[PDB]
From a paper:
We identified C12orf29 (RLIG1) as an atypical ATP-grasp enzyme. Our biochemical and structural characterizations revealed this enzyme to be a 5’ to 3’ RNA ligase, structurally and functionally similar to phage T4 RNA ligase. Although the 5’ to 3’ RNA ligases contain the ATP-grasp fold, their catalytic mechanism is different from canonical members of this superfamily; they transfer an AMP moiety from ATP to the side-chain amino group of an active-site lysine to form a ligase-(lysyl-N)-AMP intermediate. To gain insight into the reaction mechanism of RLIG1, we solved crystal structures of WT (adenylated) and K73M Yasminevirus sp. GU-2018 (28) RLIG1 (YspRLIG1) in the presence of ATP.
In the YspRLIG1K73M structure, ATP was bound in the active site. Both structures were virtually identical; thus, we use the YspRLIG1K73M structure to describe the interactions related to catalysis. YspRLIG1K73M clamps the ATP molecule with two antiparallel β-sheets, a common feature of the ATP-grasp fold and the RNA ligase superfamily. We superimposed the active sites of ADP-bound YspRLIG1WT with ATP-bound YspRLIG1K73M. The pyrophosphate group of the ATP from the YspRLIG1K73M structure is not poised for catalysis because the Lys73 (Motif I) is replaced with a Met and is 6.4 Å from the Pα of the ATP (Nζ-Pα-O3α angle = 85.4°). Arg89 (Motif Ia) coordinates ATP-binding and forms a hydrogen bond with the 3’-OH of the ribose ring. Glu174 (Motif III), His195 (Motif IIIa), and the 2’-OH of the ribose ring form a hydrogen bonding network that precisely orients the nucleotide in the active site. Lys253 (Motif V) is involved in neutralizing the negative charge from the nucleotide. Superposition of the YspRLIG1K73M and T4 Rnl1 active sites suggests that Asp75 (Motif I), Glu174 (Motif III), Glu240 (Motif IV), and Lys253 (Motif V) may be involved in Mg2+ binding. Collectively, our structural analyses of YspRLIG1 reveal a minimal and atypical RNA ligase fold and highlight key active site residues involved in RNA ligation.
Residue numbers in the entry:
A (entry chain C): 16 to 34, 47 to 108, 112 to 210, 214 to 276
B (entry chain A): 16 to 33, 47 to 276
C (entry chain B): 14 to 32, 47 to 107, 111 to 276
């Protein structure tokens, strides 16, 4: 039901890039066009790690190749930003990408190649949990690899794990349909969204928000667009997030 | 209704040099003020940089040694005795990127800042939690505030952004009523171990683990503080629970 | 005086480990044997600090003597790798060992050498509390000295503490008797390694704990570190110890 991360994701709001960000109240035109077309908008949680995917029972790390640079052996394109986006198989030196596999000291690889640790929604929809799942369950899906050795573990995760994008659906997130022949009801999307991250129950756990839509489109917003900080100190642990 | 930070704040308990450690003796001035009929309100001490909203601008504090030069616009507000320094405030300088950064960003401003709008952390409607809120800086005019966040003291409070807080906002609950340690009209005080009970509060209370210390705000305008270091406790992000989730 | 064990030796692993020493799904033979014998097994929390004890009325730091070095004056042997295990009086340089004492600016040392700050279970066993205690109350017992200057304070302690080993009893920890042959019959449960790992990840207490040490009725102890279960231990991967539910 959720979309796959195969190309760069536009921002929910129009944002100038100062080389900081200068966010505005103006929504992405594509989002307006889609909302008016009647697509459903599902806000999901943005987690901080390294983009990956499961592709035929193996993990593939995302790599963006910039103009004129060697395309690695095994790179498969999936979009084009102004660099090329795509995915490839792990190399020998990808120790921490392999570490999310469950261990097997009595194998030639030391790894159970068929099982990876995941953080996902429990049986209820009230809390996350760590679960050793069959890597095949994630075939064809983009995931976020997180843990100690990725981005300084801002989420406080206890072990390298994978999380299928869109897993965490946000509660009480501003309904962006309210900002879109009638005049919009609400008009301060930047403030209202910034307020959700500052003062909601889930915001303080999250790096941002990525909207998944029916048309397969996505629209993201990082804490930096909202003039907010993202770090371990400014983040509450992910495995404590309320769902 | 709370006091203004314009001078150095004395210690609730007489401290001893070793490092300054609090002892089990109340400050003579606090004894005198409590016997003179003064209300004492325990507030939360929070770790940032001392500022104030003078007129409609943020002003940063700057102390000066008497044998030095006064910067333009500097305004003296008090004077330390131990160090002999001059206590005062100042209009922000062009380099104070993170002092300015608590203003709300404004695409319609030639500087990208709404200079009449600041982010502040304050008590919510009910009074059971803190919330971040964009306010008109004029509401803080005339008051001293603690500027906090990522780039101030290494963000021990885990704040998600640079913000201001009015001094005295967080009123403490279950903090020892220091009148039970003062001789009432001539009689033995009711309680004896102010140091132990206050240290026990910081360690085991529900608010202590979130706080750098305590500041007493009295009707006299006087203030008396205690830092965690006076009580032989650590202050750091690892030893602090996030301020935004402090129980009130 | 207390019914918990004394850390005077090395502690074996609850599970047989491989090779980094990762635990496998097999129980330590000595543990299986002790269990079948009918020993009481009390799971307790493992906390990260440094091993000490309260002897006479003084804190003593544990030092392991390698077989090719000299024994320090005042070093008591208590155990047996090929190194001996013993305890010392604190040296003048152990600033942060002495820092768990209650300060006293009127005494020659700056410390009240008769009182130490410890972290223990409160009147009701529902939370942990910091408590200034007469050091003699701990005499003869081994403690974990923790705080800001020890392993980078992964537990987020607000001050250097002493905690009697075994103070924190674990809730909903796998009962390792259902994993041992009872009267020769098949054990009730087979996957100790999986059940234990899922506890450290998804239990209420696990995320606060470096590991688990079992305290047996016969003085034995058996342990598991987060590393034995392929898990991270660090301040970022650890919830504050003073907030652990009990
Ligand atoms: N639920 C989610 N939906 C989509 N992306 C998610 C989600 N959770 C985490 N992410 C991560 O967010 C990233 C979104 O950033 P984007 O695709 O624009 O590329 P980028 O290299 O991070 O770009 P930028 O430098 O502009 O931040 C995705 O690549 C993915 O790794
Ligand atoms: N609620 C509060 N009431 C008063 N001051 C507060 C409060 N919260 C934080 N503060 C800060 O506490 C500081 C009080 O400390 P003070 O000026 O006495 O010296 P100091 O920087 O702590 O140094 P020292 O310990 O050497 O005297 C003020 O700078 C003020 O910014
Ligand atoms: N509840 C507890 N019971 C026993 N020991 C505990 C407890 N909590 C913490 N500890 C610490 O665990 C240590 C037990 O581990 P041990 O001495 O065998 O080695 P280690 O430091 O864990 O390392 P290694 O795996 O290299 O042997 C004791 O020294 C003690 O300091």
């Amino acid at each position: 039901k959720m979309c796959e991360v195969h190309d760069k994701i536009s921002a929910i709001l129009v944002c100038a890039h100062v080389k900081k960000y200068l966010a505005t109240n103006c929504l992405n035109p594509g989002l307006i066009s889609a909302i008016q077309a009647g697509a459903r908008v599902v806000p999901t949680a943005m987690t901080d790690g390294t983009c990956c995917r499961v592709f035929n029972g193996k993990i593939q790390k995302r790599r963006d190749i910039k103009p004129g640079r060697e395309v690695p052996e095994g790179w498969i394109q999936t979009g084009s930003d102004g660099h090329l986006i795509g995915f490839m198989d792990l190399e020998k030196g990808d120790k921490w990408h392999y570490d999310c596999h469950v261990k097997d000291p009595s194998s030639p690889s030391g790894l159970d190649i068929n099982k990876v640790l995941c953080i996902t929604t429990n049986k209820a929809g009230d809390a996350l949990v760590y679960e050793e799942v069959n890597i095949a369950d994630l075939n064809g899906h983009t995931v976020e690899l997180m843990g100690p050795k990725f981005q300084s573990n801002p989420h406080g995760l206890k072990a390298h794990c994978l999380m299928r994008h869109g897993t965490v659906k946000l509660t009480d997130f501003p309904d962006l349909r309210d900002y879109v022949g009638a005049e919009p009801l609400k008009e301060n999307a930047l403030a209202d969204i910034r307020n959700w991250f500052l003062n909601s129950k889930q915001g303080p756990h999250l790096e941002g928000v990525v909207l998944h839509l029916d048309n397969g489109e996505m629209y993201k917003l990082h804490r930096h667009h909202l003039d907010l900080e993202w770090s371990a100190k400014s983040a509450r642990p992910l495995d404590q997030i309320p769902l």
